[PDB]
Design a protein around this ligand. Structure first.
Ligand SMILES: Nc1ncnc2c1ncn2[C@@H]1O[C@H](COP(=O)(O)OP(=O)(O)OP(=O)(O)O)[C@@H](O)[C@H]1O
Ligand SMILES: Nc1ncnc2c1ncn2[C@@H]1O[C@H](COP(=O)(O)OP(=O)(O)OP(=O)(O)O)[C@@H](O)[C@H]1O
Ligand code: CFM
Ligand code: CLF
Ligand code: SF4
Ligand SMILES: [Ca+2]
Ligand SMILES: [Mg+2]
Ligand SMILES: [Mg+2]
Lengths: 476, 268, 522, 268
């Protein structure tokens, strides 16, 4: 399978009119295990071609969807029309504790519900009365993040000013976050807009306040949106290794928890695509070193469990080993139980900006070789981390379209595939085992040790389930 | 029933030129309507008699939603049985007026405003800044377009710039440039000057309009020149513009010129 | 920790004492969370009559809708016409949501495309993407038709879809004869149901307006059936079955049924079934057009009555018993065919279940919500069964509607204890079930939280949620049932009587406490 | 570094008056920048010497996204070391320019076009039609606004209409009206009529600008009057306007007048 992908790719692209044709042909290229730039091999992060069945989102999905939505003690106002707000209510499975409606407001949806006239006359005036009604109807709210929508971007309303007035007035933090859908090529911008949005209105407010104690171990989990509990499944290991988990960014996050990140000794980043931006301002303004880790599967977590250890004193290191020893029998037990069933079964993936490369290791351990991956909003520096985690002559996609993807699936013929909801069906119909990766398909935590357990079991219940053998009727 | 959309570079003479043309048209015993697609809200002020009445958008704000409004509330009878309406809009530096224009025209169309036997429907469009202000010239709106101009370098750059954007709606649609209407630079080398541009565009110069201060005497006295001073020199001028329009059958697709050919003209 | 032969998932895992410890340390450590005392307090507060007035005096903030935007209702309409492509002019994330959403409900594929309008689009308008997009999409997914829609982005910048489309034609991107209907779908106006009207009517025109000159009213002697935004396939199927077993000619204009239910047999089908253009083209030659949900098809009627010149019937959504005989009777009035003895039996079989189940259902106070036609429908049938429709909410309803429903309530005595609510969101109904508590709620999955919140107050205050409507994400395969006509009414009923019976079995299953009323038979 | 925005009614004299004022401001050895917040894209054409260079929004379309642009591509040096940038914009009847104004302004600010060494940043804003065109007067944009006007009823209605929309951004923000600039429209009482309105408003008439034809000579020749004919009568006038602006300290909060007091003025 060396020249194949090329006879596969330009055959798939063959259908594309010359405008789109040239373009797409550069988003999908064969992976050489050794190149350290994708500017020669593949391209990512450019505009999506019209009418093609993309899965890419918008800047909104990134700021209200992934980054802000998750702050449980705040009230994120979907500023703009009605649809968005009511399409993401509880869509993401970032878990949290608290009393929704009273203390927390995450599975909740607040929208300014723009009407015809709001658009005509523009509306900050509506935004102010609306920032008022929350303070009265939701007393325990601890801040308000105003996530903008397309209309606000065009009509040009000063949602930046109001948030200063109401808030400087109500004595509460308000984040004039700008996440207009028409902005960016994907959701990505939303992240970068979110990150910065944080460093401006939330992050720097505890700057000359030292009623806190920085322990040589204090850290913060940055980039773990805790889908399903992954954040807890990881916050457990660190703490059982002696480190003191102080903050968790988006994923049962506390507005205050975000405010204590500056006083930590180390920033642990799982999502190098979402909080990478902030983790730098985190270091150039405050001067707090950060690192990338991976908690998918035994070998990754075990490995990482040591990296984050060396950044400290030997004291924690011997303690770390104790944690590794503890779970060693458990995860070994899992593999000896499942690997036999997943062995050799190959898998095909397609995610956002982290899992595409980050789950492979969790697979290596189960013996499911990965023969194809792709991102929908990653950059070259995200593929730069991929090539290595991959085999040679494996097919990779970037912003792959229905035709593009579906044809690869149809030809490469994988035993298992992992992508999102929009795609989960098209393949389930081709009798190809599909396992949601975004939402973990409403399953348990995958990060960490306890997580790996469920994963190794979730691939088995789906891949080897009886359904598949029953697809083509006997008479045919 | 023909509907014509009047365009031009803000401050050269759309509303007066229009209200006066329909005022004249009204004089001819014609059923006319003046849709005011301009946030200023003065498109009818000279035929109805006042600052301006209750506009569509402003009115629909009161009822909460535009669908709550009634054609009876915005549509009002004025001089010579001429019907008027305003698209309304926000204030300088807030909102989207390009939206009102849409909301307003949709409403009119929606509430069957084009229902009674009207003979002419004039859209007095302000600045052609964005998509909404093109509303008047889609399909079912206006077919004839009368760009207003003058002898100034920039007044033509516009007449040119305008017709340019029209070629998009003109190719795909049926709307067409019926001619230019000039509100002069005193006639000092302009009487023929515009005619030059009218040709390079491919249209005609429908009529030339004078700089008569009777327009200020009317304007400041809250009425048209046709009601104000029926026999004044420029009262017939406006009657001419009205008569030419009525019999006009030249509707073409604009042929824009380039800055270079544009400046080439004035230069000579 | 996790033990291999008994893997604890998301819920059992964090319950383990090891994890509880963790969360407590996070909470007491860096959350700066309020003390349960005041949390319980603020809660205790929201659940009051004092909070309710404050709640309702609300006029700018909205909490948890019961509507969606228009483009979503457009896309569903399109899915209905054979081999068409829901095409949405604007942002790409919108369709990414439109899709994801329709998935979770039907849980089958949802194809729809978009001209990805980037920042430049807003600034320069959206001509090329419309031009190319029409070409690319038409070239890749090979439709027969593409019905253009629009996200907030195009509305404001007022892209003329019409012009934009025709340029692309003349400019040579798509065969000039290629069907490409369109409809501005201002998400910031009306609701999702509205999109369906605009989208439908758009098409009802594309194939008729020009050809009106040669069509005769009732040339094919058939009956048009316009469904409207409908998400229960069981309803599409049931309406077709009845007319069909009447020997009545018909045409379901907008028919999702096959496409939203493509068998998993190894072959993916981007399209299936659907209404043929040649069918939509011939529409005017029918005897008359029927609108199953008039309250969001008001723009269709204007066209059908106006352009097709159809004497559109004054019928309500075919729900419950009376509104069904009326539907059938009228169809009988038109088609010529009589009401088959078959259907008459069915009716009597329904009235049988009523007399048989009347005791349990009599007097049960309910709170409900949904679309204007649904709620108006459901409510009705609730009076027929003899239940009090206490709180009736309809977030996207209007004045003419509200007062038509009130009147339907003025008729029966079981309706004199109910109030209507329009332009009021879910968070309002959270209050209504607290101040004046139901028995149950009848709505979508979003009503899962109003349920939870009632329990936290007190088990004796909990209001169970009966899922009828849209969305329904926390359950599987309900999309296949029916809520229209006799058939779909047999179900509604069973679903309540047994919804009640179940609760009585739970309220009463305490040994030597409440189990005495645990009757074996009911 | 002071930043002033210049507003007015389309067709009265913003661009020439601005470019000449900075032309003169350059003569004075000042580091000045002109941000073209107008879709027409002529705010710099007289300082840079052509139809217009590559704009921000037009350029950024080439790079697919605005984030891909570089200040180096839009910012070009012109006469007397004056920096010039254009916001870009769609054509007549399509798109949203009010957005370009925004995207273009956020960009310049984003890319640190101000974290330079300028003394005067002039915003040439076109029609104040909607929200985005209000960009040049928020917090961190312009603090001084110089409404341009003339002796015409409709030119004042705007000078007044404009300052009205200002009080909104003025009360909540720090922006203020510095004074009116009269660019000749040829009336008789051009000297006093304006000064009068300037008082009823609460501002001053910073300067009065002649109707000299040296500007058509400069305009049609592709240049400002200051570089064209350095000693021409109106070359010193524009120098005056610039000088007065520099030394001007009078920035007030307008106080609109009513139609009735307005027309009362002219009638006087
Ligand atoms: N025939 C004329 N000669 C000289 N000046 C005139 C003449 N007709 C109108 N005017 C003057 O033109 C000015 C603007 O006229 P009008 O109200 O038609 O403006 P407009 O530019 O069309 O407005 P808008 O673009 O806002 O619709 C007024 O001051 C008016 O007196
Ligand atoms: N007093 C004057 N001095 C110089 N030129 C003048 C004067 N009065 C009128 N003009 C001429 O009128 C035109 C208006 O000038 P300018 O280019 O500033 O346009 P504008 O209408 O102010 O621009 P915009 O409306 O786009 O801001 C030019 O052709 C200009 O030379
Ligand atoms: S598709 Fe993560 S860069 Fe973003 S919602 Fe999923 S692969 Fe996102 S890891 Fe994350 S928690 Fe996600 S799964 Fe970086 S946050 S925009 Mo859809
Ligand atoms: S990119 Fe307007 S209501 Fe909102 S879904 Fe739209 S049609 Fe409907 Fe992203 S920020 Fe939101 S989802 Fe901009 S508008 Fe789409
Ligand atoms: S430029 Fe036009 S479409 Fe854009 S916000 Fe302004 S009036 Fe509206
Ligand atoms: Ca299915
Ligand atoms: Mg006017
Ligand atoms: Mg200018």
């Amino acid at each position: 399978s060396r020249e194949e992908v090329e006879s596969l790719i330009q055959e798939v692209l063959e259908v594309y009119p010359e405008k789109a044709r040239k373009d797409r042909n550069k988003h999908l290229a064969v992976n050489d295990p050794a190149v350290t730039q994708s500017k020669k091999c593949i391209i990512s992060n450019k505009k999506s071609q019209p009418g093609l069945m993309t899965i890419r989102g918008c800047a909104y999905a990134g700021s209200k969807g992934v980054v802000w939505g998750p702050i449980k003690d705040m009230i994120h106002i979907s500023h703009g029309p009605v649809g968005c707000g009511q399409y993401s209510r509880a869509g993401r499975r970032n878990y949290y504790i608290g009393t929704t409606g009273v203390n927390a407001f995450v599975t909740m949806n607040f929208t300014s519900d723009f009407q015809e006239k709001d658009i005509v006359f523009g509306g900050d005036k509506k935004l102010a009365k609306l920032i008022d009604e929350v303070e009265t109807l939701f007393p325990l709210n601890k801040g308000i993040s105003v996530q903008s929508e397309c209309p606000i971007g065009l009509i040009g309303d000063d949602i930046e000013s109001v948030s200063k007035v109401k808030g400087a007035e109500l004595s509460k933090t308000i984040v004039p976050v700008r996440c207009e859908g028409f902005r960016g090529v994907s959701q990505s911008l939303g992240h970068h807009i979110a990150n910065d949005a944080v460093r401006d209105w939330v992050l720097g407010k505890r700057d000359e306040d030292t009623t806190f104690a920085s322990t040589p171990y204090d850290v913060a989990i940055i980039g773990d949106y805790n889908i399903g509990g992954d954040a807890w499944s990881s916050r457990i290991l660190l703490e059982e290794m002696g480190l003191r988990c102080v903050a968790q960014w988006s994923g049962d996050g506390s507005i205050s928890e975000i405010e204590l990140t500056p006083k930590v000794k180390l920033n642990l980043v799982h999502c190098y695509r979402s909080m990478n931006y902030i983790s730098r301002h985190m270091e150039e303004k405050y001067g707090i070193p950060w690192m990338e880790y991976n908690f998918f599967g035994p070998t990754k977590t075990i490995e990482s469990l040591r990296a984050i250890a060396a950044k400290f004193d030997e004291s924690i290191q011997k303690k770390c080993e104790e944690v590794i020893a503890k779970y060693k029998p458990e995860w070994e037990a899992v593999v000896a139980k499942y690997r036999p069933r997943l062995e050799g079964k190959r898998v095909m993936l397609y995610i956002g900006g982290l899992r595409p490369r980050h789950v492979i290791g969790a697979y290596e351990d189960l013996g499911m070789e990965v023969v194809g991956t792709g991102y929908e909003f990653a950059h070259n520096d995200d593929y730069d981390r991929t090539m290595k985690e991959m085999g040679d002559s494996t097919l990779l996609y970037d912003d792959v379209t229905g035709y593009e993807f579906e044809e690869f699936v149809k030809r490469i013929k994988p035993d298992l595939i992992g992508s999102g909801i929009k795609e989960k069906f098209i393949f389930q119909k081709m009798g190809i085992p599909f396992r949601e990766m975004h939402s973990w398909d409403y399953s348990g935590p995958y990060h960490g040790f306890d997580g790996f357990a469920i994963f190794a079991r979730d691939m088995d219940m789906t891949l080897n389930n009886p359904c598949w053998k029953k697809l083509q009727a006997p008479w045919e | 029933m023909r509907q014509c959309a009047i365009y031009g570079k803000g401050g050269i003479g759309k509303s007066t030129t229009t209200q006066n043309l329909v005022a004249a048209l009204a004089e001819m015993g014609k059923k006319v309507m003046i849709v005011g697609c301009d946030p200023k809200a003065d498109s009818t002020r000279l035929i109805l008699h006042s600052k301006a009445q209750n506009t569509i958008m402003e009115m629909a704000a009161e009822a909460g939603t535009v669908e709550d409004l009634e054609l009876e509330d915005v549509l009002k009878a004025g001089y010579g049985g001429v019907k008027c309406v305003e698209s309304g809009g926000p204030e300088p530096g807030v909102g989207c007026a390009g939206r009102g224009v849409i909301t307003a025209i949709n409403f009119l169309e929606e509430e069957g405003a084009y229902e009674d036997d009207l003979d002419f429907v004039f859209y007095d469009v302000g600045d052609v800044v964005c998509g909404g202000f093109a509303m008047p010239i889609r399909e079912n709106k206006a077919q004839e377009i009368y760009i207003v101009c003058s002898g100034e370098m920039m007044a033509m750059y516009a007449a040119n710039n305008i017709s340019k954007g029209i070629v998009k709606y003109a190719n795909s649609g049926s709307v067409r440039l019926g001619g230019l209407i000039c509100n002069s630079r005193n006639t000092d080398r302009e009487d023929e000057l515009i005619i030059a541009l009218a040709n390079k565009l491919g249209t005609q110069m429908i009529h030339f309009v004078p700089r008569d201060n009777v327009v200020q005497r009317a304007e400041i006295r809250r009425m048209t020149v046709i009601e104000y001073d029926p026999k004044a020199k420029q009262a017939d001028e406006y009657r001419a513009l009205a008569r030419k329009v009525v019999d006009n059958k030249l509707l073409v697709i604009p042929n824009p010129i380039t800055m270079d050919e544009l400046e080439e003209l004035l230069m000579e | 920790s996790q033990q291999v032969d008994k893997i604890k998932a998301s819920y059992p895992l964090f319950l383990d004492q090891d994890y509880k410890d963790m969360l407590a340390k996070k909470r007491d450590g860096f959350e700066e969370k309020y003390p349960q005392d005041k949390i319980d307090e603020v809660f205790q507060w929201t659940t009051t009559k004092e909070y309710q007035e404050l709640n309702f005096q609300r006029e700018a903030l909205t909490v948890n809708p019961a509507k969606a935007c228009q483009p979503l209702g457009a896309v569903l309409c399109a899915l209905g016409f054979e081999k068409t492509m829901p095409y949405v002019h604007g942002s790409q994330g919108c369709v990414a949501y439109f899709r994801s959403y329709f998935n979770r409900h039907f849980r089958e594929p949802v194809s729809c495309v978009s001209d990805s309008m980037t920042e430049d689009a807003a600034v320069f308008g959206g001509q090329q993407n419309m031009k190319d997009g029409l070409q690319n999409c038409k070239a890749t997914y090979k439709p027969d038709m593409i019905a253009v829609s629009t996200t907030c982005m195009a509305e404001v910048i007022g892209d003329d879809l019409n012009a934009f489309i025709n340029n692309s034609k003349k400019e040579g991107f798509i065969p000039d004869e290629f069907p490409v209907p369109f409809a501005h779908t201002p998400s910031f106006v009306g609701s999702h149901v509205t999109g369906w009207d605009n989208m439908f009517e758009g098409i009802a025109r594309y194939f008729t307006l020009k050809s009106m000159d040669d069509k005769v009213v009732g040339s094919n002697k058939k009956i048009n059936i316009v469904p409207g935004f409908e998400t229960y396939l069981g309803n599409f199927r049931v309406i077709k079955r009845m007319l069909s077993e009447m020997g009545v000619g018909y045409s379901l204009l907008s028919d999702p049924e096959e496409v939203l239910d493509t068998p998993a047999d190894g072959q993916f089908r981007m399209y299936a079934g659907g209404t043929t253009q040649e069918e939509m083209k011939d529409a005017p030659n029918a005897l008359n057009t029927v609108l199953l949900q008039p309250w969001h098809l008001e723009k269709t009627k204007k066209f059908v009555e106006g352009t097709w010149k159809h004497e559109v019937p004054k019928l309500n959504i075919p729900m419950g018993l009376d509104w069904t005989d009326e539907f059938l009777m009228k169809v009988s009035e038109i088609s010529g065919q009589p009401i088959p003895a078959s259907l008459t039996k069915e009716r009597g079989r329904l009235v049988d279940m009523m007399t048989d189940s009347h005791t349990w259902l009599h007097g049960k106070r309910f709170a409900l919500w949904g679309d204007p036609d649904f709620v108006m429908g459901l409510v009705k049938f609730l009076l027929e069964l003899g239940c009090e429709p206490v709180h009736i909410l309809c977030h996207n309803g209007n004045k003419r509607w509200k007062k038509a429903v009130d009147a339907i309530l003025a008729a029966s005595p079981y309706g004199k204890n109910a109030t209507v609510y329009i332009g009021k969101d879910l968070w309002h109904l959270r209050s209504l079930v607290f101040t004046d508590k139901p028995d149950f709620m009848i709505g979508n999955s979003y009503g899962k939280f109003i349920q939870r919140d009632t329990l936290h107050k007190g088990k004796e205050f909990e209001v169970p949620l009966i899922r009828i409507g849209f969305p329904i994400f926390d359950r599987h395969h309900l999309h296949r049932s029916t809520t229209l006509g006799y058939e779909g009414a047999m179900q509604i009923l069973t679903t309540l009587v047994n919804s009640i019976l179940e609760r009585l079995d739970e309220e009463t299953r305490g040994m030597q406490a409440t189990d005495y009323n645990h009757d074996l038979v009911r």
